[PDB]
Design a protein around this ligand. Structure first.
Ligand SMILES: CC1CCN(Cc2c[nH]c3ccccc23)CC1
Ligand SMILES: CC1CCN(Cc2c[nH]c3ccccc23)CC1
Ligand SMILES: [Zn+2]
Ligand SMILES: [Zn+2]
Ligand SMILES: [Zn+2]
Ligand SMILES: [Zn+2]
Lengths: 360, 360
């Protein structure tokens, strides 16, 4: 059976389980079940399923080199699909909540969930809470007897927490750290002194890389009972490296990719985000260019946004990106080589993860 | 050592652990640590700690009748305090998010967290996510080797989920179920046909009773390794009974308790909430009174709110409440008696829980 169709069939199965359990154990009525069914589909489906399918792909790799009864192969693949959906539902939670937090309009070419006429923010905040709660309902049901349950739950929690911490780093990235204070309304930074590579790295590591790259890779190892086929420090290093590169692409595309292909109107400049573009620009600008950036960044005024984009274009950031990319290629290849000492199979799953990121 | 001071000392210990782990493992800077410290204090402290202290009180009861080394007594009490704080932090999550969802102004006489000038909704939604994430960080750290870890995590998840489901029942309680539809803006009910005792019961059971009464009682049993001293079906029945009574008091006070003692301006009428007052009023009103209720309920206009309050006062709901109360006293006493078959100690902890609710 093809991996994607297996993964999609498991979605339908998990959805049916969750809704049927709501009816049998939580007293749900059919109309609210339908609302939640639509909410699940609208918030969980429509992406590429890169994260969930990486769990499946890692598990598939180990199945090719490990002796198992057929029924065991099917159990491992089913577990990998359920684990994958846990990650996809975790992402769905964070997308719903982040779109509300940021006042976003569109995502993947459709209105953000909270903007649907029959949803509203009051409902959508709680819908997002339910989405993450479903990840745990899945795990406790499908993985109840599994030897990896404890390790899986502990990892999933740490990744969830890291993502929330990353969200805090992101939403506060345009404020001066020494001025953070719940009692006092927060001004935007004027010096941009915290727009550094190391601080940018910290936002991205926590907000993006743990859930997008580390969690799918390690979840694939866990459901395969294969954590001894890897040096975990290498897995973390390669996950953080590829994840940062992924976010850099995303930051570049926010500014320069047309809205129709982006599926949204990018607002990183108006939002004063600590983006790779802003950090790299400030790392090469002269005094006059810095001053012009300061006078225009973080303002909705389309003229000032236009000034920032022209500053980026004139600054030849394409060349900094090519140098960054070449360095990432160097390091990802080195880590893939270190991963072969213990598992050619896992190293190849990482190579596939890298190829799908680098040529997306 | 007195129970409350032990519980408060454990708060300081847990807080120090969480913040120190953020510095050692999550790359936090001192200013963001301070923000999170203030957020924790502001959202977790200032209540009565009824929920957390019930864990401690249940554990204390069993310590009086069970043979243990002194060090074991201290471990059990420390575990009960950590478990109690898990519940208090779970509540804090739901209060932060519910205040944002509902546009609330005040809570316990202070502005809601999201209204602090230096917080804002963008931050506060994520702060609420962090609060619940902290419940899991606590459990995995303090309970890592504990025999009750799995049962505790599984129970906590089900209660978290039930609460989110209850939140959905609450926010949708003034809409017609057959008209729920993410695509279509939701009108308020005109017939109030779903303002029934059974539907009200369902909102309250899930939104309030699981986390407020069932979870503290069962958590006390778990950290005491005492689940065999109870019939769990009795524990659930008594928890749901006392919890409903607690919410009924809350609903009455929303309308009739002065704002200064309430610590907020009650808006259940304007919010068109399915409150005990509205359900009980509709259960006894004549046709003219129903029509006047319909023309005035769920509107911000203070004149129309005033009409609803006069309808409630004229309807002699105090007498329905006294009859409801007397029936609850009957049933709570019956269940406490059934609980004595297996544990006088646990039955007495429930009697204390009931006394603190009934005479609050
Ligand atoms: C949770 C927050 C919003 C999502 N972001 C990661 C991210 C970057 N580009 C994406 C495209 C699609 C889906 C997710 C992403 C991390 C912070
Ligand atoms: C999470 C939502 C808001 C809180 N509510 C329970 C509740 C009723 N009265 C209270 C007074 C103080 C603290 C909590 C409560 C359950 C739904
Ligand atoms: Zn965001
Ligand atoms: Zn982006
Ligand atoms: Zn509410
Ligand atoms: Zn209330």
């Amino acid at each position: 059976m093809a991996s994607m169709e297996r993964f999609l069939s498991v979605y339908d199965e998990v959805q049916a389980f969750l809704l049927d359990q709501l009816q049998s154990k939580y007293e749900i009525d059919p109309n609210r079940a339908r609302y939640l069914r639509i909410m699940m589909d609208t918030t969980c489906l429509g992406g590429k399923y890169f994260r969930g399918m990486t769990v499946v792909n890692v598990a598939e790799g180990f199945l090719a080199v490990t002796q198992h009864d057929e029924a065991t192969k099917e159990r491992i693949l089913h577990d990998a699909c359920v684990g994958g959906w846990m990650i996809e539902f975790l992402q769905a939670h964070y997308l719903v909540e982040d779109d509300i937090m940021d006042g976003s309009v569109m995502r993947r070419g459709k209105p953000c969930w909270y903007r649907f006429p029959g949803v509203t923010t009051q409902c959508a905040i709680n819908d997002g809470i339910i989405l993450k709660s479903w990840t745990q309902i899945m795990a406790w049901h499908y993985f109840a007897d599994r030897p990896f349950l404890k390790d899986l739950l502990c990892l999933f929690q740490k990744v969830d927490y890291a993502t929330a911490v990353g969200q805090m780093y992101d939403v506060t990235s345009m404020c001066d750290s020494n001025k953070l204070d719940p009692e006092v309304a927060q001004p935007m930074t004027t010096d941009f002194a915290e727009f550094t590579p190391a601080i940018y790295k910290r936002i991205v590591k926590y907000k993006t890389t743990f859930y997008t790259y580390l969690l799918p890779l390690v979840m694939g190892l866990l459901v395969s009972e294969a954590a001894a086929s890897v040096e975990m420090n290498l897995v973390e290093r390669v996950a953080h490296l590829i994840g940062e590169y992924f976010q850099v692409q995303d930051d570049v595309m926010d500014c320069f990719t047309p809205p129709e292909q982006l599926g949204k109107v990018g607002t990183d400049i108006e939002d004063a985000k600590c983006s790779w573009l802003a950090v790299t620009f400030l790392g090469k600008a002269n005094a006059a260019q810095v001053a012009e950036f300061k006078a225009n960044y973080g303002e909705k005024d389309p003229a000032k946004v236009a000034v920032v984009k022209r500053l980026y274009s004139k600054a030849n950031l394409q060349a900094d990106f090519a140098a960054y990319e070449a360095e990432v290629v160097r390091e990802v290849e080195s880590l893939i080589e270190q991963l072969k000492v213990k598992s050619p199979t896992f190293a190849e799953s990482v190579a596939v993860v890298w190829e799908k990121t680098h040529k997306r």
